Design a binder for this molecule. Structure first.
Ligand code: CLA
Ligand code: CLA
Ligand code: CLA
Ligand code: CLA
Ligand code: CLA
Ligand code: CLA
Ligand code: CLA
Ligand SMILES: CCCCCCCCCCCCCCCC(=O)OC[C@H](COP(=O)(O)OC[C@@H](O)CO)OC(=O)CCCCCCCCCCCCCCC
Ligand SMILES: CC1=C(/C=C/C(C)=C/C=C/C(C)=C/C=C/C=C(C)/C=C/C=C(C)/C=C/C2=C(C)CCCC2(C)C)C(C)(C)CCC1
Ligand SMILES: CC1=C(C/C=C(\C)CCC[C@H](C)CCC[C@H](C)CCCC(C)C)C(=O)c2ccccc2C1=O
Ligand SMILES: CC1=C(C/C=C(\C)CCC[C@H](C)CCC[C@H](C)CCCC(C)C)C(=O)c2ccccc2C1=O
Ligand code: SF4
Ligand code: SF4
Lengths: 146, 38, 80, 83, 119, 741, 59, 119
């Protein structure tokens, strides 16, 4: 909220229309309309079925970062004992099959412990969050300018 | 006899009361709409 | 191994042993309570550490405490 | 478990001859159900890369032939349940 | 139980591992003789250089590019696992002969498919 | 044998046990020493198979509760007919359906919200219907408001018969278990009596009400010169002019001269290009086919006369060699446990509801249904989501049967537990299919995403790039083009216009266009195969590992809604058969979110839209699918960003409530996450640190304020994830297409 | 429906007679429900024959 | 597997051919006289002990812990006695002098290889 607020304050100063902020920031569709829906337009046009431009990195990264962020939810929402009894199906299927029961593990396959799992879901939440917003700051201001 | 004891439970009193205060606000906002003063 | 330690709140009501699905805990005759019983945990090498004991431990606060220690083959409880 | 894998070919006469002589004209096959396929495989058999999705008498009489042929050979293995 | 019958047992028995006795260099040379002939396929028709006359050469450099990585995985797995010296594929020496057989037989499979894409 | 044995005057009808909340469970009538008694009051309120093991008392409770459900459904339908009567513009809508947007609910005039009253024509405003009731009523033949008032009145009357019915069947005439396990008679009366006489009598309604009325409305007569439906039965002379086959009476029926009923009943298919719906001749003929075919279908179960089957002698005869015992046991499984029957009936009910959704977009069965696209949209969408959730209930109640009512004595070597003998080989190949389809259904989107982002659009999976034209769907779709002359011999038009000939334009609005499936639609079908296999992975993992996993070898002892076992085995959080249902609800939201996002964007690019003169074509998005569904930037830009423009700009206008149900449903969505990520070991002594601030001021609550339990504290996270996430797409869909359609 | 020379009732009673011939085989007790069940089945077979003989072919 | 991991061999006797439920899953035949059962891990085995004992009399039962060197152990029973029943032979280990209330703070255990309860 600090950096959405700062960044949407200065996309009103740098554009010039301060009234675009002050009339359309006192409510939430002012934010999701006048800031996220409008300033992601030169982002999400980073590459089209007509071509691409220099923002095609960030518009890629943007999407990439959503895929980071929601993978975090797989570790944050859904906890271990699902996977600890699913790795047993994978290790049953690997042990029982031919042509791969030769290639046996040394470290026994075990689902991630529930401090690590909350931690790795937190790490994908951070990396997805921060890469999404570093995509949107730079692609947004670099799309309205430069 | 025990019907009033059902009408004394938590959700039934909470709906007969929040229905009443909601009626205070809705009937007090038809009669006095756009009340930003006072 | 998960070090299970059984403190002196253990009034010997045996919901720990009847609750543990691993027989790591037994009952020991100990003349310090009214029932004369106090649980013991000799075979903590088999201890999973699922803390199903500490669910059914009706003391004031948890005569039997399961400290999560090392992780061997059996204590990890993997099937293969 | 497969105790009696005796014969397969008895299904073939069991499925071609029950569909050859019934013509049932106004469908894809003005002739019988199998003549409209066996007549329509020899035009394509000698290394022809044709036969697109609009090729009705080949592609349709692939599935509508094999879906009864599979069922009648499976019921041919049910023809070794009474043994 | 089921899918362990004598047709399954006879077919898995004469595979290029479960068969009785081969030198592990040739035992791996049969493995790479299959796989290296195989891996030219999904790089010629679908690779990045599938439109120049390097439809076929990019299959070699890409496929052998996989092959040296796969032998690197072979040598890692025989480095970490298979600590004993029972002289077969469960050893170190037999496994590195299996890996060298996979490398020479696999590059031989790649060049064989490359020269058989001439026709 | 078959007889009716009913206890009379079973339970007294006093209000006494209402004064004892939690009277029902002996584990719960202790009184609340904590607030978790409150919530467990509600989660145990319908554990009818967990009050008492006596199946008679359980079965009386449920069978009386069904009439409570039908009481709420008749209150609901009587609500729809009365809101159609008093509040709606239905009589005005019946004049010109393509101009007047349908609306019933007329918002009360308080502060601002009178702006929600959309001026939808008809001389009266109000918020617009997207449920499509008016299209059901024009098909029904309801002419003026009086039949809506009368049918709402009969809806209340049937609601009173269901309240008095369930009251009568729990308290003062309640049946024995011998009445309930009479399942040959239950099928014998539902296959014949419910469904059979329902479709037959409905064919009577359609022939003697809807066919003359929706012939007169197909001619374009205003609903004043139309006589009563009533007035068609007093004399055939008002129907012999419309259909001359009514002049012959029933004499060509009983002489089997059914060629003569070609006027009333026919086999055409297609769509009537005047009304944009099905031909009601085809629909009435159709319900006669369900009528004779279901009434024949009812009589395969021997009840009293030694004529018919029993389920036992059917199931025991399928003693196939790869299963060994065969189905020996399932008639004792499915006539003792109710959760098993609930698993089957919820699975087939939900999948029937999805079948309902598909058969309502592609064969629009109501007149002027495909001309107002929101009713065309949301009736697809809504029957998907109950079409979805009812599948997960299968995965719930097949799990519960495996936990609660499973019994290895009756269930020994049969078809059931021989699955559980190789459930590793079940779940492992679901695991392989999920990863194979995930790579080959989503890695294609990352691939085309990068190839469009790397500039090399030749290396994509587009039309022009590496094509992935769905061969089988185009082929069998072409078989359906070649249906009505070749194989459906007595047909005239195709089964749908989602298959074959040129499109249907009704009032410059496209009813149904032949859907082309090329190389993007392929990959979305592999999405759907993928996210169907993942929910099948979680909901078969939740049934096969419901009872004795190799991780935790006693889940039957722990229960169904247990949270976990503990930190042992490295942690076994979220391991119960309930928890797989918890995950199947998220994947339900995924799988159906992309079913409807596949729908509402391929059918805004390839079907819907308007037409101009000389047969020209104009979709809503304008053909912008196959060049844009192949990536995700094309997906998120061209659909979730571009289609938001009529939701997000909706303030000040009549769609603005959706603009409130768009933001707030984001809220609830994100408000779910607080319950999902955190846990009650935080909230319990956060709360208890607040209980310090109440103990300081003597505002200590007597019911001790615990945090939520774990299974509750995650169940509420699902139940906000779905209300928030579903209501986002709800307000986004209806705010999108009302601004166009 | 005309008399004894060949028409629709000529080819219903033969289907009803072979239907009650099936009722002699399918739990062949001589009770009422042999007739009410099995004449009904041969009645189904009869109606399935009559119009099927009427659609594709001369009656 | 049986080449490197401990297989637990539950042995027991009964009186009638009943039907119990495996911890693998699915029903088992339950030989009436005397029967063994090789299992994977101990919780499965004692979960079968609760599976049988909470149903009916199944006593004189115990797992021999097959460890892959070959010999056996005696789990469960240990002393012809049921574990929550008190025998005067079990010597207690795993206790301290008091409750948690006298455990030392871990800033006293810090930089030492002790535990927070040892006193
Ligand atoms: C329970 C809350 C509540 C309360 C305190 C009131 C209070 C009042 N209502 Mg009221 N009302 C309520 C609920 C309530 N209403 C509901 C739920 C409805 C819908 C059926 C109405 C419908 C209603 C009407 C139609 C009218 C009132 C009127 C009045 C006023 C009469 C003096 C009084 C202020 C009357 C008034 O003064 O309005 C002019 C009037 O005409 N009410
Ligand atoms: C929690 C924050 C908050 C606050 C401080 C306010 C404050 C206000 N809102 Mg409000 N509002 C909020 C949240 C909030 N709102 C939310 C979350 C929503 C969405 C549901 C709304 C939706 C909303 C509407 C739709 C309207 C308001 C209005 C108002 C104003 C008058 C309220 C009213 O009905 O007076 C009248 C009530 C009384 C006179 C009752 C008091 C009498 C007492 C109880 C009697 C006893 C005395 C001793 C007031 C400035 C109204 C307005 O005109 O805006 C300026 C208005 O129409 N609000
Ligand atoms: C999983 C989905 C998927 C698929 C099918 C492809 C497919 C492709 N990508 Mg790719 N890609 C993907 C995901 C995917 N990608 C993702 C997720 C990313 C981003 C992380 C990328 C990033 C990417 C780049 C950057 C590039 C490609 C390129 C390509 C093309 C050539 C790659 C190649 O040589 O294949 C390798 C194939 C193999 C090594 C063969 C293994 C697969 C075989 C066929 C399995 C067979 C098993 C067999 C059936 C077993 C049964 C038989 C047995 C019983 C005997 C090819 C069309 C390149 C290109 O130019 O496109 C034209 C390119 O430059 N991709
Ligand atoms: C042919 C007769 C007949 C008919 C029409 C029905 C119809 C129905 N049964 Mg039912 N049933 C029957 C015979 C019949 N049953 C027999 C013989 C048995 C014993 C084996 C059962 C046992 C049974 C159970 C155990 C349950 C049902 C349920 C249902 C309802 C399903 C919900 C539904 O489809 O909503 C559509 C709703 C309607 C179409 C409304 C129909 C209501 C009208 C008035 C017809 C009802 C006829 C009624 C039986 C007459 C009572 C006779 C009495 C006065 C002597 C539906 C009302 C379920 C339910 O929801 O409970 C109510 C349920 O759980 N039935
Ligand atoms: C966007 C977030 C996200 C993603 C990608 C996944 C992905 C997956 N989940 Mg999932 N999940 C999520 C959120 C997510 N989940 C959430 C929020 C929940 C909460 C309810 C769940 C709950 C859940 C359950 C309960 C289960 C899964 C399962 C799976 C797997 C299904 C198999 C598959 O698709 O393989 C294909 C893999 C992908 C499509 C991921 C993209 C990979 C690309 C295509 C290729 C690789 C990229 C690149 C080449 C990597 C190499 C380069 C790199 C090393 C530098 C898959 C990995 C199932 C499972 O574990 O086994 C099947 C399962 O049972 N999930
Ligand atoms: C001849 C009588 C008849 C007529 C006029 C209709 C007419 C209709 N049905 Mg249909 N239907 C029928 C019989 C009939 N049905 C039977 C007997 C069944 C059960 C098998 C169905 C099952 C059915 C479904 C599931 C659906 C329809 C739908 C429709 C409507 C779509 C328009 C269309 O082209 O459908 C033309 C109809 C057909 C092509 C169906 C032909 C069914 C044949 C007669 C089945 C014969 C069964 C017989 C035992 C032989 C089995 C083997 C056979 C498969 C080779 C239309 C009103 C759809 C709908 O609801 O519209 C929105 C829809 O979803 N019908
Ligand atoms: C042996 C005499 C006989 C003959 C010549 C026919 C002929 C026919 N039957 Mg038929 N039928 C028969 C006996 C016969 N039936 C019997 C004994 C039954 C069981 C009651 C049926 C039940 C039956 C059904 C259920 C249907 C036909 C239909 C048909 C017609 C098309 C068949 C098709 O789709 O291919 C065709 C005119 C179908 C049709 O379209 O009727 C016009 C159709 O749906 N038949
Ligand atoms: C459906 C076709 C499946 C072939 C099963 C063959 C089949 O039904 O054989 C029937 C066989 C049962 O044999 P029995 O003679 O015991 O059957 C009689 C009894 O089952 C009934 O009393 O079923 C199995 O063995 C299932 C094997 C799982 C087979 C794994 C494949 C199934 C999952 C794959 C789904 C594929 C869909 C592909 C669509 C193209
Ligand atoms: C689909 C199918 C299948 C599969 C397939 C396959 C099996 C294939 C493969 C194939 C392959 C995979 C092949 C391979 C090839 C190779 C060969 C036959 C050989 C050759 C030789 C070589 C390669 C050589 C090399 C070299 C060189 C060149 C130089 C020097 C070195 C060396 C000597 C190494 C089957 C039949 C099962 C069944 C039916 C269907
Ligand atoms: C998906 C998922 C998994 C599956 C994750 C698997 C087990 C890990 C797969 C990623 C590893 C890194 C793949 C192995 C390949 C590596 C290259 C091998 C070397 C890695 C180490 C040397 C670091 C869990 O174990 C889990 C545990 C607890 C809660 C939620 C979840 C969970 O959501
Ligand atoms: C916030 C949160 C809580 C706290 C939720 C609190 C305890 C419940 C707050 C809602 C209740 C209903 C408020 C009580 C208000 C009463 C209804 C009385 C108020 C008067 C009127 C509204 C009737 C958990 O208990 C929890 C448990 C497990 C995982 C996550 C969480 C979690 O995220
Ligand atoms: S400690 Fe709690 S559980 Fe263990 S014995 Fe004493 S009372 Fe029973
Ligand atoms: S630790 Fe886990 S296993 Fe050992 S006793 Fe306490 S609960 Fe039973």
């Amino acid at each position: 909220w600090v950096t959405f607020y700062w960044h949407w304050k200065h996309l009103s100063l740098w554009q010039g229309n301060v009234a675009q902020f002050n009339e359309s920031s006192t409510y939430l569709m002012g934010w999701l309309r006048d800031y996220l829906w409008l300033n992601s337009s030169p982002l999400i046009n980073g590459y089209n079925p007509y071509g691409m431009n220099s923002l095609a990195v960030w518009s890629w990264m943007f999407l990439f970062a959503h895929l980071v962020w929601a993978t975090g939810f797989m570790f944050l929402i859904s906890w271990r004992g699902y996977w600890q009894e699913l790795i047993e199906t994978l290790a049953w299927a690997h042990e029982r099959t031919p042509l791969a029961n030769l290639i046996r593990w040394k470290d026994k396959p075990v689902a991630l412990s529930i401090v690590q799992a909350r931690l790795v879901g937190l790490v994908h939440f951070t990396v997805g969050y921060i890469l999404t917003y570093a995509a949107f700051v730079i692609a947004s201001t670099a799309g309205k300018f430069s | 006899m025990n019907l009033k004891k059902y009408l004394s439970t938590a959700p039934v009193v909470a709906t007969l009361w929040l229905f009443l205060t909601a009626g205070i606000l809705i009937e007090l906002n038809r009669f006095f709409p756009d009340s930003l003063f006072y | 191994a998960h070090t299970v330690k059984i403190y002196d709140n253990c009034i010997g009501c045996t919901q720990c042993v009847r609750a543990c699905p691993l027989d790591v805990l037994e009952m020991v005759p100990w003349d310090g309570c009214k029932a004369g019983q106090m649980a013991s945990a000799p075979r903590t090498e088999d201890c999973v550490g699922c803390k199903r004991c500490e669910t059914a431990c009706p003391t004031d606060f948890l005569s039997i405490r399961v400290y999560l220690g090392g992780e061997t083959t059996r204590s990890m409880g993997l099937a293969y | 478990y497969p105790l009696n894998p005796a014969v397969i070919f008895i299904a073939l006469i069991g499925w071609s001859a029950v569909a050859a002589i019934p013509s049932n004209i106004p469908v894809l096959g003005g002739t019988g159900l199998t003549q409209a396929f066996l007549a329509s495989i020899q035009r394509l058999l000698a290394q022809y890369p044709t036969g697109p999705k609009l090729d009705d008498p080949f592609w349709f009489y692939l599935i509508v032939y094999h879906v009864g042929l599979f069922a009648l050979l499976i019921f041919g293995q049910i023809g070794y349940a009474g043994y | 139980p089921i899918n362990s019958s004598s047709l399954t047992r006879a077919y898995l028995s004469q595979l290029p591992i479960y068969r009785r006795g081969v030198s592990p260099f040739l035992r791996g040379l049969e493995i790479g003789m299959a796989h290296g002939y195989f891996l030219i396929g999904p790089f010629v028709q679908l690779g990045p250089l599938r439109n120049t006359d390097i439809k076929y050469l990019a299959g070699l450099l890409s496929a052998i590019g996989l092959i040296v990585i796969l032998t690197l995985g072979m040598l890692l797995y025989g480095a970490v696992s298979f600590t004993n010296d029972s002289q077969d594929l469960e050893s170190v020496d037999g496994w590195r002969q299996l890996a060298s057989g996979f490398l020479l037989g696999a590059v031989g499979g790649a060049g064989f498919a490359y020269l058989l894409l001439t026709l | 044998q078959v007889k009716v044995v009913v206890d009379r005057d079973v339970v007294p009808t006093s209000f006494e046990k209402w004064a004892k909340p939690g009277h029902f469970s002996r584990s719960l009538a202790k009184g609340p020493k904590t607030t978790t008694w409150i919530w467990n009051l509600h989660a145990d309120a319908h554990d009818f198979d967990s009050h008492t093991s006596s199946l008679e008392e359980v079965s009386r409770k449920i069978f009386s509760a069904h009439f409570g459900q039908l009481a709420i459904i008749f209150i609901w339908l009587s609500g729809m007919y009365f809101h159609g009567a008093r509040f709606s513009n239905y009589v005005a809508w019946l004049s010109n359906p393509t101009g007047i947007k349908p609306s019933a609910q007329v918002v009360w005039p308080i502060v601002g919200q009178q702006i929600l009253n959309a001026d939808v024509g008809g001389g009266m405003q109000g918020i617009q219907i997207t449920s499509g009731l008016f299209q059901l009523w024009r098909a029904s033949g309801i002419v003026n408001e009086l039949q809506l008032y009368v049918t709402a009145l009969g809806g209340l009357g049937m609601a009173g018969l269901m309240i008095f019915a369930g009251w009568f069947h729990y308290h003062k005439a309640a049946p024995k278990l011998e009445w309930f396990q009479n399942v040959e008679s239950m099928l014998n009366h539902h296959l014949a009596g419910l469904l059979g006489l329902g479709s037959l009598s409905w064919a009577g309604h359609q022939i003697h009400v809807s066919l003359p009325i929706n012939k007169l409305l197909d001619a374009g007569v205003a609903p004043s010169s139309i006589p009563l439906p009533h007035e068609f039965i007093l004399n055939r002379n008002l129907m012999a002019e419309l259909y001359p086959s009514f002049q012959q009476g029933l004499v060509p029926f009983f002489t089997l001269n059914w060629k003569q009923y070609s006027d009333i009943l026919t086999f055409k298919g297609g769509l009537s290009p005047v009304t944009g719906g099905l031909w009601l001749t085809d629909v009435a003929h159709h319900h006669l086919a369900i009528a004779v075919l279901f009434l024949v279908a009812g009589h395969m179960y021997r009840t009293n006369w030694g004529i018919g089957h029993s389920i036992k002698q059917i199931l025991e005869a399928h003693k196939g060699p790869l299963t060994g015992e065969g189905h020996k046991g399932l008639y004792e499984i499915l006539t003792t446990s109710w959760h098993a029957n609930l698993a089957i009936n919820l699975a087939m009910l939900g999948s029937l509801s999805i079948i309902v959704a598909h058969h309502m977009y592609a064969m629009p069965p109501y007149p002027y249904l495909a001309t107002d696209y929101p009713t065309q949209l949301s009736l697809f969408t809504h029957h998907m989501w109950i079409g979805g959730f009812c599948i997960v209930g299968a995965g719930a109640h097949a799990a519960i049967y495996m936990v609660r009512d499973y019994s290895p004595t009756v269930n020994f070597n049969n078809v059931l537990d021989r699955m559980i003998r190789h459930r590793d080989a079940i779940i492992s190949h679901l695991n392989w299919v999920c990863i194979f389809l995930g790579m080959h259904s989503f890695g294609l989107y990352i691939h085309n995403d990068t190839m469009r982002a790397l500039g090399r659009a030749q290396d994509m999976f587009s039309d022009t790039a590496i094509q992935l034209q769905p061969v089988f769907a185009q082929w069998i779709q072409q078989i359906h083009t070649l249906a009505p002359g070749n194989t459906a011999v007595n047909a005239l038009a195709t089964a749908s216009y989602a298959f074959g000939a040129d499109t249907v334009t009704v009032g410059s609005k496209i009813a149904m266009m032949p859907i082309k499936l090329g190389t993007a639609d392929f990959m979305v079908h592999h999405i759907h195969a993928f996210t169907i296999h993942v929910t099948t992975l979680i909901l078969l993992k939740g049934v096969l590992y419901a009872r004795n996993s190799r991780l935790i070898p006693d889940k039957a002892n722990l229960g169904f809604r247990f949270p976990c076992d503990g930190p042992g085995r490295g942690g076994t959080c979220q391991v119960s058969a309930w928890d797989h249902v918890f995950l199947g609800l998220f994947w339900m939201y995924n799988a159906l979110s992309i079913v409807i996002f596949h729908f509402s964007w391929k059918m805004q690019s390839d079907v819907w839209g308007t037409v101009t003169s000389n047969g020209a074509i104009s979709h809503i998005t304008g053909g912008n699918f196959a060049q844009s569904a192949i990536t995700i930037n094309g997906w998120l830009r061209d659909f979730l960003w571009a289609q938001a423009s009529q939701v997000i700009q909706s303030y000040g206008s009549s769609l603005s409530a959706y603009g409130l149900m768009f933001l707030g449903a984001h809220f609830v969505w994100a408000f779910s996450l607080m319950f999902l990520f955190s846990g009650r070991g935080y909230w319990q002594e956060l709360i208890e640190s607040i209980v310090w601030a109440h103990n300081k001021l003597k505002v200590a609550p007597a019911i001790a304020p615990r945090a939520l339990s774990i299974t509750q504290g995650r169940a509420v996270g699902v139940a906000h994830y779905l209300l928030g996430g579903i209501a986002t797409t709800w307000a986004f869909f209806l705010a999108r297409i009302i601004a166009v359609g | 429906m005309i008399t004894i020379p060949y028409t629709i009732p000529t080819i219903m009673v033969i289907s009803n007679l072979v239907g009650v011939a099936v009722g002699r085989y399918a739990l062949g007790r001589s009770d009422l429900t042999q007739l009410i069940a099995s004449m009904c089945f041969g009645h189904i077979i009869g109606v399935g024959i009559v119009l099927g003989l009427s659609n594709m072919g001369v009656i | 597997c049986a080449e490197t991991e401990e297989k637990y061999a539950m042995t027991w006797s009964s009186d009638q051919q009943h039907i119990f439920e495996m911890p693998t899953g699915g029903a088992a035949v339950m030989n009436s006289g005397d029967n063994l059962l090789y299992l994977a891990r101990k919780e499965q085995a004692l979960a079968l002990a609760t599976q049988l004992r909470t149903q009916f009399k199944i006593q004189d039962y115990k797992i021999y812990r097959i460890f892959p060197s070959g010999e056996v152990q005696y789990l469960h029973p240990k002393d012809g006695v049921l574990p929550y029943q008190v025998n005067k032979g079990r010597e207690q280990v795993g206790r301290v002098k008091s409750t948690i209330g006298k455990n030392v703070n871990p800033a006293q255990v810090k930089f030492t290889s002790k535990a927070t309860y040892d006193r």
